[PDB]
Amino acid sequence: VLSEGEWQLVLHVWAKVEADVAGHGQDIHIRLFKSHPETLEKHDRFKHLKTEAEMKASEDLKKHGVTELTALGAILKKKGHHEAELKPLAQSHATKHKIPIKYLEFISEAIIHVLHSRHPGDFGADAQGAMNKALELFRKDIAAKYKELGYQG
Ligand code: HEM
Ligand SMILES: [Fe+2]
Hints:
The protein is mostly helical. 76% of the residues lie in helices and 0% in strands. Protoporphyrin IX containing FE (HEM) binds at residues 39, 42-43, 45, 64, 67-68, 71-72, 89, 92-93, 97, 99, 103-104, 107.
């Protein structure tokens, strides 16, 4: 459970994000792939972009990240009251794409890293801290849902 102050910082920085969902989406995916190329393998139609310029200019990849960041931002805005939208996501991620919880840390890392790099002044220690707290709540709660549907994190 996050303090009201922590939630405010989360949605403060995220408002920043919303000034360019697509661009942030791209840099997070690129960050993520580079740090952990096993990640790119679950992303089966993005498997074949070989460079970041290729990655950047791919509409498909682009739109993909918007879809993703938009779902994530809607979840953050519920300030933890989010089972109604955590459910369809864990369902497709648990029993389809088959994304292990470790992969959710990986992307949480990329997220923190990308936010800091673009919004340092709005992403100091308190803010950084809050976002971690939020994303660890997200990963706690989706793990719980992963188990309810069979096969774990
Ligand atoms: C903040 C964490 C992320 C969120 C909220 C999330 C959300 C979403 C959403 C909303 C979609 C589109 C509909 C659906 O399939 O549910 C999706 C698709 C997908 N997600 Fe995630 N994503 C997250 C993490 C990622 C990561 C970490 C991976 C791989 C390591 C993964 C792989 C995929 C794949 C492979 C698709 C299908 C794309 C296809 O159409 O080609 N997810 N995700
Ligand atoms: Fe993705």
